[PDB]
Design a protein around this ligand. Sequence first.
Ligand SMILES: CCCCCCCCCCC(CCCCCCCCCC)(CO[C@@H]1O[C@H](CO)[C@@H](O[C@H]2O[C@H](CO)[C@@H](O)[C@H](O)[C@H]2O)[C@H](O)[C@H]1O)CO[C@@H]1O[C@H](CO)[C@@H](O[C@H]2O[C@H](CO)[C@@H](O)[C@H](O)[C@H]2O)[C@H](O)[C@H]1O
Ligand SMILES: CCCCCCCCCCC(CCCCCCCCCC)(CO[C@@H]1O[C@H](CO)[C@@H](O[C@H]2O[C@H](CO)[C@@H](O)[C@H](O)[C@H]2O)[C@H](O)[C@H]1O)CO[C@@H]1O[C@H](CO)[C@@H](O[C@H]2O[C@H](CO)[C@@H](O)[C@H](O)[C@H]2O)[C@H](O)[C@H]1O
Ligand SMILES: CCCCCCCC/C=C\CCCCCCCC(=O)O[C@@H](COC(=O)CCCCCCCCCCCCCCC)COP(=O)([O-])OCC[N+](C)(C)C
Ligand SMILES: CC(C)[C@@H](C)/C=C/[C@@H](C)[C@H]1CC[C@H]2C3=CC=C4C[C@@H](O)CC[C@]4(C)[C@H]3CC[C@]12C
Ligand SMILES: CC(C)[C@@H](C)/C=C/[C@@H](C)[C@H]1CC[C@H]2C3=CC=C4C[C@@H](O)CC[C@]4(C)[C@H]3CC[C@]12C
Ligand SMILES: CC(C)[C@@H](C)/C=C/[C@@H](C)[C@H]1CC[C@H]2C3=CC=C4C[C@@H](O)CC[C@]4(C)[C@H]3CC[C@]12C
Ligand SMILES: CC(C)[C@@H](C)/C=C/[C@@H](C)[C@H]1CC[C@H]2C3=CC=C4C[C@@H](O)CC[C@]4(C)[C@H]3CC[C@]12C
Ligand SMILES: CC(C)[C@@H](C)/C=C/[C@@H](C)[C@H]1CC[C@H]2C3=CC=C4C[C@@H](O)CC[C@]4(C)[C@H]3CC[C@]12C
Ligand SMILES: CC(C)[C@@H](C)/C=C/[C@@H](C)[C@H]1CC[C@H]2C3=CC=C4C[C@@H](O)CC[C@]4(C)[C@H]3CC[C@]12C
Ligand SMILES: CC(C)[C@@H](C)/C=C/[C@@H](C)[C@H]1CC[C@H]2C3=CC=C4C[C@@H](O)CC[C@]4(C)[C@H]3CC[C@]12C
Ligand SMILES: CC(C)[C@@H](C)/C=C/[C@@H](C)[C@H]1CC[C@H]2C3=CC=C4C[C@@H](O)CC[C@]4(C)[C@H]3CC[C@]12C
Ligand SMILES: CC(C)[C@@H](C)/C=C/[C@@H](C)[C@H]1CC[C@H]2C3=CC=C4C[C@@H](O)CC[C@]4(C)[C@H]3CC[C@]12C
Ligand SMILES: CC(C)[C@@H](C)/C=C/[C@@H](C)[C@H]1CC[C@H]2C3=CC=C4C[C@@H](O)CC[C@]4(C)[C@H]3CC[C@]12C
Ligand SMILES: CC(C)[C@@H](C)/C=C/[C@@H](C)[C@H]1CC[C@H]2C3=CC=C4C[C@@H](O)CC[C@]4(C)[C@H]3CC[C@]12C
Ligand SMILES: *[C@@H]1O[C@H](CO)[C@@H](O[C@@H]2O[C@H](CO)[C@@H](O)[C@H](O)[C@H]2NC(C)=O)[C@H](O)[C@H]1NC(C)=O
Length: 1489
Amino acid sequence: MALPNEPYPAWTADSQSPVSIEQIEDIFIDLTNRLGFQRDSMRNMFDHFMVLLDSRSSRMSPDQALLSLHADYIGGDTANYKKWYFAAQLDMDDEIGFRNMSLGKLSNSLEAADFRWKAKMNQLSPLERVRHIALYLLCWGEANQVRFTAECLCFIYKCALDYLDSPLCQQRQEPMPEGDFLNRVITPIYHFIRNQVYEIVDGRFVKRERDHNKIVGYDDLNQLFWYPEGIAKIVLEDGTKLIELPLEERYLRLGDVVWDDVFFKTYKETRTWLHLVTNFNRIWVMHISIFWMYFAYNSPTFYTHNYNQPLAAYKWASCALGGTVASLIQIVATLCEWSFVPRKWAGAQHLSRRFWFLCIIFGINLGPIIFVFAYDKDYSTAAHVVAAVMFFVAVATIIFFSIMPLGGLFTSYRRYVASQTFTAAFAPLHGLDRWMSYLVWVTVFAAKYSESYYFLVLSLRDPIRILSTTAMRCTGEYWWGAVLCKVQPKIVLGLVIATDFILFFLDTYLWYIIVNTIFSVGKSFYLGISILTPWRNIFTRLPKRIYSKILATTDMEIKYKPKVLISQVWNAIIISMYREHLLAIDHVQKLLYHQVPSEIEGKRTLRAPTFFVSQDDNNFETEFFPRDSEAERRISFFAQSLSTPIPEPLPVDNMPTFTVLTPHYAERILLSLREIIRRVTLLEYLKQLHPVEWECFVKDTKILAEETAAPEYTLRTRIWASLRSQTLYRTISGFMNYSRAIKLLYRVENPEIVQMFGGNAEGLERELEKMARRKFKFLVSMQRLAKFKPHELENAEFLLRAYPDLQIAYLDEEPPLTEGEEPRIYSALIDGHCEILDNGRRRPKFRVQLSGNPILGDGKSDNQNHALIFYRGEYIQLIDANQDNYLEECLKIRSVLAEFEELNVEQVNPYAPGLRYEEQTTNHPVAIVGAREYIFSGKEQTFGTLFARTLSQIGGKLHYGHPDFINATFMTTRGGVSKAQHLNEDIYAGMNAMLRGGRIKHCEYYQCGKGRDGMGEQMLSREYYYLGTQLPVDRFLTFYYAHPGFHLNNLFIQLSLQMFMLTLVNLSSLAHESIMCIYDRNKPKTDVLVPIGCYNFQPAVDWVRRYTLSIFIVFWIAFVPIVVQELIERGLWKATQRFFCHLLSLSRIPFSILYSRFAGSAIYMGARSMLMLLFGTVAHWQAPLLWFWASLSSLIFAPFVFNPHQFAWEDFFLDYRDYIRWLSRGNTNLIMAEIIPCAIYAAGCFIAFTFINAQTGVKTTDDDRVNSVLRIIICTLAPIAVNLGVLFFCMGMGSVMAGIAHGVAVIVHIAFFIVMWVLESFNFVRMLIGVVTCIQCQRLIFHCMTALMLTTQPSRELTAKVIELSEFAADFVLGHVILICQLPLIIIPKIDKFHSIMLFWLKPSRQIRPPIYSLKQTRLRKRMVKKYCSLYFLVLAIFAGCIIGPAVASAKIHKHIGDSLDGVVHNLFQPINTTNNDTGSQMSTYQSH
Ligand SMILES: CCCCCCCCCCC(CCCCCCCCCC)(CO[C@@H]1O[C@H](CO)[C@@H](O[C@H]2O[C@H](CO)[C@@H](O)[C@H](O)[C@H]2O)[C@H](O)[C@H]1O)CO[C@@H]1O[C@H](CO)[C@@H](O[C@H]2O[C@H](CO)[C@@H](O)[C@H](O)[C@H]2O)[C@H](O)[C@H]1O
Ligand SMILES: CCCCCCCCCCC(CCCCCCCCCC)(CO[C@@H]1O[C@H](CO)[C@@H](O[C@H]2O[C@H](CO)[C@@H](O)[C@H](O)[C@H]2O)[C@H](O)[C@H]1O)CO[C@@H]1O[C@H](CO)[C@@H](O[C@H]2O[C@H](CO)[C@@H](O)[C@H](O)[C@H]2O)[C@H](O)[C@H]1O
Ligand SMILES: CCCCCCCC/C=C\CCCCCCCC(=O)O[C@@H](COC(=O)CCCCCCCCCCCCCCC)COP(=O)([O-])OCC[N+](C)(C)C
Ligand SMILES: CC(C)[C@@H](C)/C=C/[C@@H](C)[C@H]1CC[C@H]2C3=CC=C4C[C@@H](O)CC[C@]4(C)[C@H]3CC[C@]12C
Ligand SMILES: CC(C)[C@@H](C)/C=C/[C@@H](C)[C@H]1CC[C@H]2C3=CC=C4C[C@@H](O)CC[C@]4(C)[C@H]3CC[C@]12C
Ligand SMILES: CC(C)[C@@H](C)/C=C/[C@@H](C)[C@H]1CC[C@H]2C3=CC=C4C[C@@H](O)CC[C@]4(C)[C@H]3CC[C@]12C
Ligand SMILES: CC(C)[C@@H](C)/C=C/[C@@H](C)[C@H]1CC[C@H]2C3=CC=C4C[C@@H](O)CC[C@]4(C)[C@H]3CC[C@]12C
Ligand SMILES: CC(C)[C@@H](C)/C=C/[C@@H](C)[C@H]1CC[C@H]2C3=CC=C4C[C@@H](O)CC[C@]4(C)[C@H]3CC[C@]12C
Ligand SMILES: CC(C)[C@@H](C)/C=C/[C@@H](C)[C@H]1CC[C@H]2C3=CC=C4C[C@@H](O)CC[C@]4(C)[C@H]3CC[C@]12C
Ligand SMILES: CC(C)[C@@H](C)/C=C/[C@@H](C)[C@H]1CC[C@H]2C3=CC=C4C[C@@H](O)CC[C@]4(C)[C@H]3CC[C@]12C
Ligand SMILES: CC(C)[C@@H](C)/C=C/[C@@H](C)[C@H]1CC[C@H]2C3=CC=C4C[C@@H](O)CC[C@]4(C)[C@H]3CC[C@]12C
Ligand SMILES: CC(C)[C@@H](C)/C=C/[C@@H](C)[C@H]1CC[C@H]2C3=CC=C4C[C@@H](O)CC[C@]4(C)[C@H]3CC[C@]12C
Ligand SMILES: CC(C)[C@@H](C)/C=C/[C@@H](C)[C@H]1CC[C@H]2C3=CC=C4C[C@@H](O)CC[C@]4(C)[C@H]3CC[C@]12C
Ligand SMILES: CC(C)[C@@H](C)/C=C/[C@@H](C)[C@H]1CC[C@H]2C3=CC=C4C[C@@H](O)CC[C@]4(C)[C@H]3CC[C@]12C
Ligand SMILES: *[C@@H]1O[C@H](CO)[C@@H](O[C@@H]2O[C@H](CO)[C@@H](O)[C@H](O)[C@H]2NC(C)=O)[C@H](O)[C@H]1NC(C)=O
């Protein structure tokens, strides 16, 4: 009688409740009779409302519970309905944008409408507030896809409310037919969404094939209701408009709207780089425009005439062109953005106004610069002062354009591109959070710009002066003379600057990591965590930290002895670990709190485990739990997390209700005996993996078996094996520790309740379970429970008997009501307490009909949305089906729900006339609280973990993921779990929540567990557009460098490696042919260069040292946050494992598949770069080039060094056998992406080739020009021509007739590698650049050919064949070189065992059973392993012979092949006996040609 039995005791048992359940029920019933809601959906939402009303009034008064629920749903500043109303109903979106900007920089009007709205809300009676929330929930509970479009539902709510309040409805006598709201209103909107993606093909539904710019999605549908212009587009069937009807007559005609003639695309996606320019224009302005000024200032030789350090007016006016560059990036950004947006919507007339202001600013920068340059008398103060002034106009332009957001440019004079309410409403940072965001980004760019000047630019001052002034003394080609080879130093310079332009971008990410690592270690030190202390200090203080931070002991109870309560909670944790078979009996006893007889007889005493004492008493080093154990992990994280700031909890009865929502489609529920016991079966594979867990399991099995002394025993092995594998049972069993934790806390903190029962221990467990049923709900969404196979159906029924309180929501098809129509779909809810019908299926508690099949998109989010109407409580924890939790973490739930900042706060009237928006303290609610996750059994994955504390403080966390909790009333009123309209990562998934004003938090003291499993389409999303062009700079820099700046960093690293190869092949080609001066160290600029006539290119060659260091640091800096994170928690040695797991990540898979899986990914590019790297080292050797050898050897030889059983003799040559069988058997967006980049690379190699044959420094005349351009044509087209020539034999004449053509292509391609080698007169260095050029030239030839035939018909299939013969030889020759490289190590005896020991010693040593072959097949194995062994040794004898052939052919004293040709073919073979050292004391005949 002292403990109420009613379902909602905090409301019903309180006498201060303004309205009873009877009145609240009559309101829900009246609304259903009036608007035709489903009766079963009304019962669901009536139950949902009462739980919200009972979880709220659990911690406040019932009057404040109803008032705060009305504010959060209808009329508060946190209500999405108030935001939509002030934007779409009152045209006040621009006023909201003005005050957002004014409030963001802090640490008839809008104000009159706000005061008028608060006074209308304040006069509502409690019954009117119930009717408002009930109407919204009833509309929300039958929306089922309009839940994804929040603002479409606000419009439907207002149409329904206006109709409801009218005499047209109050005077109506008959009720609306049941299901009328869904049939007439919701279903047509669903049919629009479905017909955008699906088509009817003779009766079924199959996806349409359309680009994403033809599909009107959820966002394009939602945004119509953001503006009064959009609502003015809603048109009825008869032709009229919806807004032409009185307010109360519009709901009744929402079924006559032709939604196809209304909805339209609001944001079209385009080419990826067009979005990067607009969305991240502030990133390009600073790097691109500061780079210009850095290099214009440090390159006086580009504007000095007849090179003279004076005449500074030219130096200042040349830097001042960085303001013209910044003003031009903004023009291009505005032009790109003008193509994403429809031309008459939401703004975009302000886009044309902005373009003209940016054209004025750009003219102001350009104009006076033209005056300075073109009106100078070759020290004119009329131009020396202009140049100085225009340098600061340039600087001020750069600062303005890289600070101020693009969308908020010139908006002070529809002024915004998108509505502010829903797109530009980010929560500002205040106080210490704000100053840390400033300090991070000031430090990142003060350190970046400081050392990018001294190391990237000042080091280049002499290379720029030298390479831009020297002219080569070459002879050149026959076709153009010496006009291309005398500008080679300038071509080398232009490539060097372009390579340093990309290093300018890699530099910023280098400093983002360095600064964030220091700030994430100084934050831990300041917060007191500061983990360098031994674990003895962490564990000794644990007993006191359990009393404070877990036990809610702020003295409601009368000061019980703390040791009693800690023991009751510490022991339950350990017993939980012991029943999980993680602790042995000798471990547990040393860890428990033990009752001991007192000094006084007939008494008991509590004493702490030595674990809490022996750590302090370090005389001994006993083991309480095993090394590297899971109990070692969980206890060490538990004690470590309780050393951090944790909010103090509420009593359990004051706790909010929450829900765990889990989507399930096809995952395994339980392991069945078939798949555990029948190359090693599952059950015996687990014993090998979890040995000590199993023996403790059987040891308990022995006790249980001998207790009864099998169906009981066969189950506990299915359960034991399921709890070690990724199953749904393991997740459900792990997250029912919330029910166990809530019961334990309720019992430990309420001794009076327990003592009240006093021996009625069975009746107490009813009381503890009644409370845990009230505060925790587990909801699993089983999408296909209606189509479960009987073994799966039996698995699900086992869940509902082990856990009666678990609820399962499922889709329930139903025959069509009339023949030749669509089946009816329902959402149904069952649980363990449901009556079990005759057919073995439980009768559903609720059964709500949908408009149609809800699964229209990418799966998970549609599943979560159908089951979302059955969630209860204030918070939802999203959970994935392959997770699990622990009791010691589930004990911290009351302090994780306190991160939403609604539990221990005062309640004020949200409609009080005194307050103004600016002084309200609840304007930005916490939307998401994220938590750490443990992966049991990547760069950015563990980048975020170390930075998560700093990124959450400065607003940089946008994670709508699976391990985290959400504010249910905030999120479900604003679109829900996701959008279901695209393989988006969850790293940036809740930014709709952040765009709409919610904050996203991160707690470091909670950690669940989860099992493991190009730019992307993320860059084309509108959320990047809204975030990029509207965030303030400090918060834009955190947004860019967290997710998208990481993906661009990877791209820039690759581009920087391909531009170094093009630069190196030209810088080594220039150093090979030049006599370079002795590089005197510590010498002035105009000092004497020792060999008179030399080239001073040693400074330019040393640039390779500096670039190599830069890209070496850039590689190894991505590991610093990885090592520091593990070094600071594990402490000494586990950093090494994560360092090597990260580094290594970067039967026997055959070469036929392993090579083909990485051929177009790393092998092809890395084999072309290795040829270019090979030329670089032989042409001019430098030590730093070794790192590019190691980094390219690994890139190619990684997949073939970790393949198990790759390196043994016998299996090696059998893999070659199937490799050969694989070879024979089997019978403007493209141009601007990889066609021009492919031509530039061929041109850059062509320049390097022709210069190395330019005879630099040979005393020649006009007829000593070589025709090295012809050598390219002869060695590029001729192998292609003969590839086509044989295909005309096949048509003139299917493996024998094809392998002859396949064999011919290999022969000719190798033959012309030999033809080039002799055209260069047997010069190995000149051949390498010759062959590289031809490979790149054929790639360009096919690349333009492929796009030409893939935008005649008989050749449209022929061209794809000649492209393939040359392609085939590329695979044949490249494949063997990988194989031939395996030769020196297979001949090492005992290499397979030697290699495979570390293949399993460093990793867990998984064992595959050694195969046993027939003694008849073995005789065939011996033959065939020695059959193709004699072929691999012969292809190696042909590949080798092609190398020692021309190499030995140097014994050709006779002058050179073809001494008597004349004309376009004279000197087709490079001359010899020519010494290109024309430097020295000789000063006559300066003219080498
Ligand atoms: C060596 C390294 C280089 C140093 C960089 C030097 C550049 C200096 C930038 C100065 C700066 C960025 C600071 C962030 C540092 C990040 C550095 C990263 C470097 C980038 C590579 C600080 O901005 C000022 O800082 C003040 C202090 O916090 C604060 O003033 C407040 O507190 C005072 C005290 O209580 C108090 O007196 C005062 O009343 C308060 O108002 C305000 O934020 C602001 O006045 C400017 O930021 C911009 O300021 C704009 C108007 O404010 C702001 O509004 C603009 O955009 C909106 C949309 O259209 C819209 O509002 C408008 O269109 C437009 O007006 C922008 O949103 C914002 O982005
Ligand atoms: C103000 C900003 C300035 C910043 C500096 C800008 C430098 C950026 C240059 C990058 C660039 C321009 C080259 C020059 C073009 C002409 C310009 C005129 C030149 C002067 C006259 C060439 O660089 C790219 O780099 C790739 C990596 O090396 C490489 O791809 C090669 O390596 C791979 C792994 O090794 C491997 O797949 C394979 O070996 C190759 O594919 C190619 O070389 C090339 O695609 C183009 O970048 C690319 O553009 C793509 C679509 O726009 C974009 O793809 C996205 O959209 C696609 C649509 O459907 C979609 O299909 C993609 O899924 C999607 O991801 C790429 O993300 C982006 O990379
Ligand atoms: C000692 C002297 C050595 C020189 C030997 C030279 C003799 C060679 C003689 C003949 C071989 C020439 C055949 C290829 C000709 C056509 C080129 C071609 O098809 O490119 C293709 C790949 O193919 C390559 O990239 C070739 C790479 C070089 C490997 C060949 C030599 C390997 C030796 C060096 C090994 C490392 C050396 C380091 C030290 C060992 C490009 O295909 P794709 O464009 O990526 O297709 C993508 C699909 N898409 C278009 C739709 C996107
Ligand atoms: C970053 C952009 C906006 C502009 C400011 C960059 C300017 C750089 C390239 C140039 C312009 C003014 C230069 C100037 C400032 C101070 C002097 C001292 C003088 O004895 C030698 C040159 C030296 C050391 C240079 C350093 C680099 C500067 C700062
Ligand atoms: C990738 C970018 C940075 C490349 C294309 C730019 C290179 C420019 C900045 C550099 C490379 C070589 C330089 C070049 C070398 C010498 C000459 C001749 C002189 O009478 C005027 C300056 C002039 C014409 C300059 C102009 C600027 C040049 C062209
Ligand atoms: C990134 C750096 C390396 C590049 C962009 C530097 C570019 C500037 C320094 C160079 C490139 C083109 C040059 C430009 C082209 C032609 C003229 C006219 C001549 O009578 C004097 C030099 C003068 C006036 C120079 C001025 C300086 C310029 C603008
Ligand atoms: C938004 C950015 C683009 C705005 C604020 C511009 C910042 C520039 C002007 C400022 C920020 C940091 C400054 C930087 C830091 C330290 C020195 C070292 C000195 O030997 C050369 C100039 C140099 C390298 C200056 C150049 C000017 C810089 C680069
Ligand atoms: C990379 C290639 C495509 C570039 C360098 C080719 C340029 C050639 C085709 C063009 C550019 C300017 C022309 C030109 C300038 C100087 C040369 C060398 C001289 O003795 C005869 C005239 C001659 C031959 C002519 C004809 C062809 C030239 C050299
Ligand atoms: C990114 C790389 C691939 C591209 C940009 C390389 C560009 C450099 C090599 C090329 C592009 C424009 C060229 C440039 C334009 C015209 C003149 C002709 C002559 O008077 C000197 C060489 C000079 C000055 C050359 C030097 C080399 C340049 C600068
Ligand atoms: C005026 C110059 C100095 C400033 C604006 C810099 C311009 C370059 C660095 C930037 C601005 C515009 C960019 C450009 C616009 C659109 C795409 C198409 C895509 O398929 C390849 C990359 C590409 C072609 C990129 C390449 C890099 C560009 C050309
Ligand atoms: C001020 C800007 C415009 C100047 C300095 C820089 C231009 C660079 C960034 C742009 C222009 C030309 C581009 C270039 C042309 C061809 C090569 C090799 C190809 O296989 C991949 C793309 C790649 C690697 C890209 C890299 C980025 C480049 C080099
Ligand atoms: C990576 C590739 C794309 C870069 C390096 C090549 C750029 C070529 C197209 C550019 C850079 C150097 C230029 C070259 C340098 C000097 C002049 C002399 C003039 O009388 C004719 C044009 C001519 C001969 C031009 C022709 C075009 C060239 C060769
Ligand atoms: C792998 C096979 C196909 C190798 C052996 C092919 C070799 C032939 C195709 C190539 C290799 C080098 C070539 C050889 C080098 C230089 C000369 C001198 C010239 O005045 C006539 C052609 C001649 C004599 C050619 C003939 C064809 C040869 C011999
Ligand atoms: C196994 C095969 C692929 C090996 C042996 C091929 C070797 C050929 C291609 C190599 C080795 C010896 C070379 C040979 C020896 C000397 C002469 C000089 C001149 O008179 C023409 C080229 C010529 C004839 C070259 C051509 C290329 C040859 C013939
Ligand atoms: C190219 O020829 C010049 C001139 O014969 C050589 O220059 C000599 O280099 C040595 C090396 O220190 C100096 O001691 C001599 O004083 C230089 N001679 C003159 C006249 O300056 C140069 O070494 C040669 N380069 C080669 C052979 O690679």
